Every structure is written in C-alpha cells, then in structure tokens.
Symmetry: C6
Subunit: 205 residues, 6 copies
Amino acid sequence: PIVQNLQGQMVHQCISPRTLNAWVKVVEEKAFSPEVIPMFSALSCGATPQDLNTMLNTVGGHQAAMQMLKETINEEAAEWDRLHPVHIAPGQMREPRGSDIAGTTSTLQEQIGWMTHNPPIPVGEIYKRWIILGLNKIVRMYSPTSILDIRQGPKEPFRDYVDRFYKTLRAEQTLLVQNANPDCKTILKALGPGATLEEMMTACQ
Amino acid sequence: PIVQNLQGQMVHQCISPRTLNAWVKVVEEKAFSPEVIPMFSALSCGATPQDLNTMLNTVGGHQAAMQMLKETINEEAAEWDRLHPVHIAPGQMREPRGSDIAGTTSTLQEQIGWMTHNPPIPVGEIYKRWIILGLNKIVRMYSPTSILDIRQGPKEPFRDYVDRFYKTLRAEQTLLVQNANPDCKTILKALGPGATLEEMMTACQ
Amino acid sequence: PIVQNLQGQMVHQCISPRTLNAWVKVVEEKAFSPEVIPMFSALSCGATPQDLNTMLNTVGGHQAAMQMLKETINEEAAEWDRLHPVHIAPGQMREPRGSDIAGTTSTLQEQIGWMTHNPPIPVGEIYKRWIILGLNKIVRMYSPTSILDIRQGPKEPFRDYVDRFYKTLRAEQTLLVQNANPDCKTILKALGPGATLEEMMTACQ
Amino acid sequence: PIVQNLQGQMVHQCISPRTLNAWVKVVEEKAFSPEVIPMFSALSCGATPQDLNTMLNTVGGHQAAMQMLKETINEEAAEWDRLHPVHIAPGQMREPRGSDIAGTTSTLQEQIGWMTHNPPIPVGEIYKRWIILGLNKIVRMYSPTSILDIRQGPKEPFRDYVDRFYKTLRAEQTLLVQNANPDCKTILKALGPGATLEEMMTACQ
Amino acid sequence: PIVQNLQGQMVHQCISPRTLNAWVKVVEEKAFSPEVIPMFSALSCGATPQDLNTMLNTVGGHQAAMQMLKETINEEAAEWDRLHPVHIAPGQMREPRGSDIAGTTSTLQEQIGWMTHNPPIPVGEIYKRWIILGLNKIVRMYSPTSILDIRQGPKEPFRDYVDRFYKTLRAEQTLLVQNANPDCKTILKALGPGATLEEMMTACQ
Amino acid sequence: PIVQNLQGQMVHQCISPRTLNAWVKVVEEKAFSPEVIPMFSALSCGATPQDLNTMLNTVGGHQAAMQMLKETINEEAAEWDRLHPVHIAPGQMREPRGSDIAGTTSTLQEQIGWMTHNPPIPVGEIYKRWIILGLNKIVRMYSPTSILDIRQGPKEPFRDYVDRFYKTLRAEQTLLVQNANPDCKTILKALGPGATLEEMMTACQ
Ligand SMILES: O=P(O)(O)O[C@H]1[C@H](OP(=O)(O)O)[C@@H](OP(=O)(O)O)[C@H](OP(=O)(O)O)[C@@H](OP(=O)(O)O)[C@H]1OP(=O)(O)O
C-alpha cells in the first residue's frame, strides 16, 4: 500500500502477511456473502493495483467468480479508454490506460508515481471501484433465495424471520408484513401505518 | 482512524486487520450482550465515519438489528439538520450535514479535513454517539428476561443469584431482597437497612 | 494509555485490541483468582480513567463483583472529596473531583490534561489504586476455603500440600507444620526451629 | 528485505518470523496449487537473494520440486552469464554473475550494495523472476487433470462445473459449452454467440 | 522495560501483553523444567524490578516455589544491605537498599532514575541475578530422578538413553558408559579412552 | 539482536517473544530435520552471542544433541585461539577469545562493542558459523535411512519416490535411475543420457 510515514511523506509499504492471510480466510469462510465486500474494501486501504491483483490472485477456489470478475474489469478498462485516450517525453510521467489502472501493463514504480503525483491520479482507488462493481454482481448471482420466498414460519420467532428477510434483501441488493405469519400479520395490521421496525418487532415479541 | 504520529501531527491511518477481526468475532460470540458496546467503543477509538461504517457493514448476521440501527442513525441525522442548517467557496471547508456525519454523502478527505481542523468538527465522535444510542436500544430489545423474573432458587447460591440479577439489570438498563429465597431473605431482613452488597453477600454465604 | 513517543513527549494512544482481548480472556479463564490482579495492573500500564472503565466494562459476567467494585470506587471518591474540596478561569485547568478521577464526570481531554500537566495530577494511577482496593476485597470474598481446612492428606506429597496451603493464604491475604500429616509432622518437629521452607520440603520429600 | 525507514533511506531489515511461518504453512496446506505463486511473490516483497534462499530452503517436503527448481535457476543463471560477462578496483562495486544473483556466491553486503546503488541493480527482483519461472513449471507438472477430462455431471450444478473448469485451466496455464451436460448445453447453444460468462451461468442456474 | 527509542535515549516502555502471556504459558506448560530459566531471562530483557515482580506475581500455581523464591530474594537483599549500607538531599538520587532493588520499597520513577543514571545503578540486572539464583534452586528441588537411576534399558536405543541422561544432569546441575546396557557398554569399552560423544553415539547406533 | 533504528545507528534490541516461541516450536515439531537449519539461521538474523545462547538454551529436549553441539563449539573456539592469540588499556576494547565469541566469558556490552566497532568484529556471525557446523553434524547423525535403501516400490508413483530420495540426500548431505522400479527404469534408460529431472518425472508420470 501507499502510507504516510512518521515524518509525513507518502511511501510504498509491503502488503503485510496479516492482511494477506485475513483476506484468504474471509473468502474461505464466507464465500460471497455480502459482508465480504466491506471487508475487502477495508483490507485494501491504500492499495496499489499490484496489491489489489495480489489479493484477488491469492484466492484458490471460486474460479468461476474470479473469471466473471476479470470480465467486469475488462469492460470498465475499455470504458476508461473510451473516456481517456492516450498518445513518451524522456523522464516524464505517461498517462495511464485501462490496463495500466488494472495493473497488467503498468509497473509498481509507475503505479507509485501516479498515486503520489501532485495532483495524484488515484489509480488504486479507480481500480478498487471496478473490482467492487464486479464483486457486487457476484454477490447478487450467488444469493441462494428470492425475497419472495422468505416467509415467517408458524413457530418462527418474528426476530429470526426479520433477520432472514434483511439478510436476503442485502444479497439481492409492506412485503415484510405480507410475508409474516397469520398471528404477527394481525398484530402488525392493527399497529396502523408508518410503524418503525423497532415497534413492529416489539409488538410481535 | 486519525492518530498522532511519532512527531505530533494528526494523520489518517488504515483500520488494522486485528481491529476488523476483533469486532466481527465479538459480535459472533456475544451478539448484543451489553458488554459488546464498551468493546465497540474501544475498538473504534479515533475512528472516522468511514471506519465506523466499515465496522458495522462487516457484520454478516443480525440484519434486523443493523436495519433498526440505520433507523436510529437517520433520526439523529434529521435532528442534526434541524439544529445545524447549511447553505461552496473555492478551496474552503463546507459545513457537514447529518448524512455527512454518518459518512454516506462525505468523502474520507472531507472527514479528515473536519476532524483535523483548528478547531475540529469531531464528526467521528458525533457519529459514534448516534451509533451507541442505536446499539443501546438493541441491547434492551434483545434482553431475554425481565428483572421481575429473576428470583433465587431454593438451592441456588446467593452469589449466582446476584450475578443473574445484575446481568439482567444491565441489559434492561430492595428488589434484590424481595426476590431472594426464604432462607437468605430472613438473614437479609435481620441485617437492618443500608447494608452494602458485600455485607449482604457475606451474610448469605 | 499515555505513552512516550519515539521523540520524547507524553501522548495519548488508543487501547490496543491485544490488550482488550488479553484482559477479557484472563477474567474468563481465572475469574478472581489472586493472580488476576497483577495481570490487571500490568495490562493497564499508562491507563487513563477512560481506559480503566473500558477494561472493567468489557467484562460480561461476574456482575455481582462489578457492582461491589462500583461501591468501593464510590467510597474512595467520597473520601477524595473530603480531603480535596473544589470550587472556571477561561482556558485554565480545573481541579478534579472524585467522579472526575473515576472518569464518570471528566472527558478524555481533561484526563490527558491532568496526567501530562507539569507537575502532573496522576488521575489514572489514583483511580487504579481505588480499583485494586476493590478487586482485593473481591478476591478475598471469592476465596473458596479457609486456611484452617488445608491439611495434608495421608497419601498427599508434601509439595502438593504446601502448594494448596500458600495458594489459600494468598487468596485470604507453624500452622504449616500443625496441618501436616503424622509422618511429615514427626520429621518436621525433629528439624528444630527456624527451618527454611526449602529445608522442610527437602526433609519431607 | 530492503525497506524504506520512517526517514526515507533504503535499509536492510531481518525477515520476520510471521513471514517465515506464513510461507511454510501455505506450502504445507496448498502444495503447488497455482494460488501459492502470488502468495510467494507477496511474502517476498523487497527480498534480497539471501531472503529468497531462506524461504525456499525452509520448505521441508517436496524435495523433487525443490530440485527441479534448482535446475531452472541454474539454466537462468547460465543465460545471464551469456548476456552479461564480467572480468576488482579497491573499494568498488563488482558486477554480479548468475550465481551472485541466485545468492550462492554473493554476500548479503554485496546484495544490499547492488540493490541500493544509484542506479540499482535489482538482484532480488531478477532472482525472483527466475524462481517464479521455475515454480510455474512445477504448478503445471503437479496439475492432476487435463482440461479435456473436466465435464459437467448429469446432476452437477453448472456453477460447480465452471469452478472445476477454470481451476484446471489455471493450473495447466466453446470448450466450456462442449463439456457441459446435455440439458445446459441445449440452453447454452440457444443463447447464440458472444455470451458473457455471467449470462451463461444465469441461463444454467 | 527500559529500551532505547528510535532517536537513542533510554526510556521506559510498558510490559507487552505478548510478553506477559508468553511467561504465564511457559510456566503452565513446563513448570520448573531447566529450560524455563533461559526463557525467563530472555522475556525479562531490559526489565525494571517492577516488571520482574509483575512476571513472578502473574504465576497462579506453584505457590510453594514462589514462597521459596521470596526467601532466597530476602537472603540476597540482606547480604546487599551488609555490603552497601545507606544513610535525602532535596531533588537528589538516594542510594538503593535491598528492598529497593527487589522493588518492594522503591517506586517505578526511582527505579528508572537508577537504571538510566550516568553511570547507571543497574537495579533490574541485580534483582534478576537474585531471582535466577532462586529459580535454579527450585529447578534442582523439582528434579524427579537422580543421575544414578538413569540406566539404559535392554531394548532402549542409545540416543534415547543419552537424551534422558543429559536431561537429568541439566536439572541436577564414564558414568555414561557405566550406566549403558551390556551390548553398548562392550562397544564403548573397546573404543578406548577420550572418545567424543558423537563417536560413542555413532558406535552404538 | 543488533538492528538499525529508523535514524540509521546500529543498536541493541531485545529478542522478541515471537522469535523465541517460533524457534522452540520448530524444534518441537521438526526435531533435526534439515529444514530446521535455514529456519535457525533466519530467526537468528542480527543475533549477538547472548541471543544465540538464549535460542539454544530454550530447547528442553534433545539434550544428547545439545551436548554434541557444545563439543563442536569448544573445538571451534580452541581453533580460534590457535589462529588469534590475545594478551587491558583503560577504556579500550579488548580482543575476543574463543569463549568470548561463544558468549560464555564476554558480557552483552562487550559483544555490542565488538559488533558495532568501526571496523566491526562480527562475533555473532562467527559464532553462528560454529553453531551451524555443529547442527549440520547432528542432522547427518539423526538421518534415519541411507540413500542406498531408498528404492521405488512396485506401486509407488515416481514423484513420491523422487521426494523420498532427495529428502534423504539432503539429510545425508544415475543412482536415481538404478533405484527406480522395473517399469520406470525401462522408460528412463530409453530417454538416453543427460535428461533433466523434469523430463524423467514427465516420462514416468
Ligand atoms: O497487526 P497484527 O497482525 O495483529 O500482528 C501484530 C504486529 O505484527 P505483524 O506486523 O508482524 O503482523 C505487531 O507489529 P506492529 O503493528 O506493532 O508494527 C506486533 O507488535 P510489535 O510492534 O510489539 O512487534 C505484534 O506482536 P506483539 O505480540 O509483540 O504485540 C503482532 O501481534 P501478534 O504477534 O500477537 O499476532
């Protein structure tokens, strides 16, 4: 990543073993559960494109997903090249192409050069946006169940139903009342409109 | 977070993998037991609003609770906008709205700018107060038992009863004597008024 | 905590996740065994009153004990207010009350201000003394057995008896000879007076 | 490794126990799965040739592979000597041979001298390229199955088939449609040409 | 401990949670096996007397041993007072007594003052010597078996016998040949005198 | 160890708990497998002789081996004294003897003095060479099997045979073809001379 030192210049630092290990584990344990994406974003804070490629490449399974991500990345790179065409002056900074931003045709030195320039071309933040676009599509695709099939069981506590319901909504990116069981539905209808979630859960406890 | 370096300027530092992992674990193990809230507060020391969103977003279950928290946050943001209306001068710091404080409409750079300004607008501390308000409501809601149903069993050591009693009081945010068993109640009545907890526990040992 | 940096000023540092986790574990594993108190003292080195409250508040069980501790803290605060009454000059340091020292009516900024003042008012060290007073009472109260009931078994090695004996003495805060079994007692009587513990253990091996 | 300090000079730092342990583990757990190579590259960031030899030498099994790697390294060193022949001036930097780059005939001091020279001779990056060439051959050799033998089972979800298919392609360094089962193949034929992987997976869900 | 910072002054640093935990574990796992003493010495590098008391006090079992250690410490303190009697000048450093060195009658500030003085009075190194004297006696006392009872079994490999033999010698602080079994003894007699241990082990393989 | 700080002077640093623990574990798990020696070398980077003694002394078993190592060290020290005889000028650096290099008759201060002198007498690197000489002899001695007894089984994959073969060669510090099974031997004979290991393994797959 690029960090500020103790004396206030922006410098390159090796990706840490703890960071590498945390990512691989979270993917092993959680696959593409929606909470994996904010974890990715936080572990890749200050990342160069090389660091972002390292994190993606260290994943060993889920190679269907990692291929779909490559496709999304290539579409975003091609749209970048559409908006930002490029033509080098000895010793001068060249302009990045899509593939430079994705770290396939750029060196670490060029990446540091762009990201620390005054003003900076934040190639790591741009690439991370493309990656997260790609990851969100994967989360949606690997969502097991439609929100239409989340209905409260006759013996299911209302709290457990609401947990399943919002978990599903998150992955898919008055239905709550419609899908409640007969007993809670009756209570909820009687609360009248514009009830908060806290009030609905309280009433159905 | 925003930290002081070794040479005494306030600077942004990446959230650490250890911090991220500690929070997710504590939520996995303890759900919304009341001791989870001081742990949240300590792990989020120096946090920007972006860091606070990261910590909340990395939680994978309990999505009913995380929705109720969003509701509380939106009420606090709306009250902020009531007390602090806003109208930008090239190169100058804009005034934060509620949604800026909650980190949904503000950038990390703006967040750092507010928090390090002379004098600072402590947007991370303000947002953390809203979050903790929301978390306290969740702790109360997920409290399993009323204090009225904590009564000492005929064979239950007085110490174990007092542990259950104050554990319940904490989550709900002379009853101790009333709810004691016949044998301890008699001892306790005879101690006369204004006995410390240490004396009551000693007497009932 | 308040630490010295690499360049020799006293500065505030966030409590670390490792410190938070170590305390909670030691309390989970050892409850109020006497060795928990030196561990508390070492983990809270440089602590502000806010840090000390964090460590106490992150404990989830033992709420009878944590209530008894609050009582001890309130007695020490009230004695502080007796010895050190207080009456603020714009921009000047106010004098701390008992509740300021215990961190319930003081801010982190005021706490840092006192502890780094020339000369310092060491509010973290004062509060830690009150806490340890309270913890020692809890250790004594949760001591399972009287020293009078620690007697060497007919088949119990003398070493194992002495371990039980001094473990009990520690928690309760010639008896060793009196409580020995017939065979060791005879050996020990014959050593004559003023024998070291090493000599007694050697003789009874 | 060679790192930048807090005050911006390039200096030698000991390889950390965490780095040493992470490599040995990943090799214990994953053998020569293709994802082991980006992990190697990331753990050896800033490495001197001595550090790279340390990491390879700390592997205890897989000695057939480690011998094959030595062979690849010796071929790359010999090609280096072909392109860059060498002839020492008291106190002056000598030119590195192949075996100097591989760290068998060079000292740590000479290695630091080359890598920190203005302009630097990046002997650690050159050696790492040779090592990765050698590792890629090993990954290909230890690939269990041909891509021709990855075919979708009659009851196998299309997602699981695509995961096996791209996992195999990665290790080997319209076939996807040809190797699909009758039911998915029919769906896929009907999508018409130039379908993305996302569309194929969606259609076959 | 007292450490050198990044800018070369000797300063006090909190004992780390990792250090505290490592000591307690090693004592839990290894009791007073002789290898515990070099581990103690290494974990207490730079220790103040307060740090050394912390490490000893955090041990929860083995209270017979910890009492025997107190006795040894009190004898060494009393011998110190014999060799170095003491008589304070406002603002000046007082001379340490035995109990000051053992950290029972001295403050952390006084301890730092002695250890960083020009020239320093190394109170932490002096106390550590007393502690190690005491620990060595405990290792000897808890040694299970005499070296006279370590004899090679008729089916016991010579290597395993030599491991038991030197393990016992270490704890107790031509016998090797005398205690060998008939078959190895014969081989060893025939090697003639002044054979190295390597030669004896080779011969008996 | 002796490290460079953030501001570029060579200074003494305490051996870390992580380093101490990593060594003890690796010896517990791997005994004197050949890969233990590069691990020792990497964990002892920058070590003083005191640090090297700490690492050796913290090993609890294998006391036959640790005695054989002492013997090797004493022979290397005696050869040092042969090549470098010594005769002290107030305040001046004395010349190290063998036993000074092995850290038995030298203090930590003298050790730091030698290693940081201009030009340095690298007593830690010299001692580490003696130790590694001694360790290599132990690895050879504890090698279970001769290379002559590594032969491919009738049903043993060629890869697994080559792994056993080079593992044994490493510990002992056309035979591969001679010891192959009939079926692979035939294939290998037919490849003709000067085949790489990769080609032999490919042919026998
Ligand atoms: O951030 P973490 O993955 O939780 O690991 C930390 C980290 O070590 P790594 O940089 O090797 O990962 C610390 O280094 P810093 O963050 O302070 O630079 C180190 O602390 P030290 O500075 O004291 O070496 C500490 O080790 P310690 O146990 O000594 O506190 C260790 O945590 P663990 O070794 O407990 O996993």
